[PDB]
Write a protein that binds this ligand. Structure first.
Ligand code: HEM
Length: 388
């Protein structure tokens, strides 16, 4: 198998050979170190003093390229920086993700979720949950967060992705980029004139001109690219995982805390991101017994780390009622997922509304093959036929 070891999955789990890899070992056509132990991953990611994030990195680089990011060194990209610089940028974008801001988004996320569910219900059982829900809700949620008018969301999605879609002609990508920046600049101007509750309005309300247009543009794109695939992947695999353990669906038929715990567990169990941004040792050091030399690259396997046998004797099982396990699916350290609360809220809303609307949800065909999404930076499904 030519595909990198950290990219291999078996069903909803990490490949056996990935799970069998040592805590920290070398892998290969550049070569890097690979961290699979929970403690090691936490050490590498939490110590920004010795492991800086590899500036200008693409979560794809393989067979595909169809619909993937294009950095070009984008200012305002939290990932391309480290403290104290990172701390400055982060603090600047934080106003849009406060928990109070997230609580207020709850009602809107529900509205969006129900609107997609309405379209699926109208199509009749059986239907593809991925086409109707998983692939639609994330982007709409992000548009709502950013402050994009409801009627411009479809257009905005096309312009955002399009101006970064390599598979497109240069004439097209450039036309889409022109319109994109133009639209973005006009949105930014309106937010500075009269700040709204959106991400941009929150930032400009707090820091005014200190937040330049370039920064805001950078923030928007970065956020648009960071919160889509991860979520669509979680919705699809998440529903599949729950349908395979139907008794655990009761965690979504009760209080909020119970739904929250289920979501956290699903996020740990499925760990859609294969790995975070590569970490580069800023000096020579000895980790997990290995001799790391300045300039060495370290790839962290979040899925393997979240299956570390040290975490629990049944860490390999899905158990929404288990004693919560501090997973690393959102990362660890100063770069910890800025949209983690939103992701948890969004995913809790989807699952709760889903099973409330379709109590008898099930796979259209018990023996149907699973259509895994293998061409994206995050694991997921391309299709999932369900009946109710
Ligand atoms: C279940 C879904 C999600 C997962 C599993 C996830 C996971 C991650 C991981 C592992 C990192 C850290 C990367 C690193 O340290 O190199 C990260 C960073 C980040 N995520 Fe997410 N993410 C999710 C959803 C979202 C959403 C919905 C948004 C946006 C609303 C988002 C915004 C970000 C941003 C901006 C960062 C960078 C923070 C920084 O560098 O300081 N993510 N995410």
């Amino acid at each position: 198998d030519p595909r990198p070891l950290h990219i291999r999955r078996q069903g909803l789990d990490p490949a056996d050979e990935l799970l069998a890899a040592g805590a920290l070992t070398r892998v290969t056509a550049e070569t890097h170190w690979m961290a699979t132990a929970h403690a090691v991953v936490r050490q590498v990611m939490g110590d920004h003093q010795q492991f800086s994030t590899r500036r200008r990195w693409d979560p794809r680089d393989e067979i595909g390229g169809k619909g993937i990011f294009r950095p070009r060194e984008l200012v305002g990209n939290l990932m391309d920086y480290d403290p104290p610089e990172h701390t400055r940028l982060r603090r600047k974008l934080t106003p849009g993700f406060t928990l109070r801001k997230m609580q207020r988004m709850a009602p809107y996320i529900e509205q969006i979720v129900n609107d997609r569910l309405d379209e699926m219900e109208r199509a009749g059982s059986p239907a593809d949950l991925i086409a109707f829900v998983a692939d639609k809700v994330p982007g709409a949620v992000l548009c709502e967060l950013v402050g994009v008018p409801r009627d411009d969301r479809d257009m905005f999605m096309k312009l955002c992705h399009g101006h970064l879609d390599a598979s497109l002609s240069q004439k097209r990508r450039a036309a889409l980029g022109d319109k994109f920046s133009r639209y973005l600049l006009a949105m930014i101007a309106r937010e500075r004139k009269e700040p709204g509750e959106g991400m941009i309005g929150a930032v400009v309300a707090e820091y005014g001109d200190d937040a330049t247009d370039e920064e805001l543009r950078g923030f928007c794109v970065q956020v648009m690219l960071a919160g889509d695939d991860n979520i669509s992947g979680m919705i699809g695999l998440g529903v599949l995982a729950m349908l395979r353990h139907p008794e655990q669906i009761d965690a979504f038929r009760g209080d909020e805390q119970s739904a929250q715990r289920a979501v956290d567990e699903l996020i740990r169990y499925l760990t859609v991101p294969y790995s975070p941004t590569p970490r580069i040792a800023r000096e020579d050091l000895t980790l997990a017994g290995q001799e790391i030399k300045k300039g060495d690259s370290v790839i962290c396997s979040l899925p393997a780390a979240n299956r570390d046998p040290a975490l629990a004797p049944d860490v390999d099982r899905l158990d929404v009622t288990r004693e919560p396990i501090p997973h690393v699916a959102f990362g660890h350290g100063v770069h910890h997922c800025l949209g983690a609360a939103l992701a948890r809220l969004e995913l809790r809303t989807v699952f709760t509304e889903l099973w409330r609307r379709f109590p008898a949800l099930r796979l259209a065909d018990p023996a149907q093959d699973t259509e895994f999404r293998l061409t994206t930076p995050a694991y997921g499904l391309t299709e999932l036929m369900v009946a109710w």
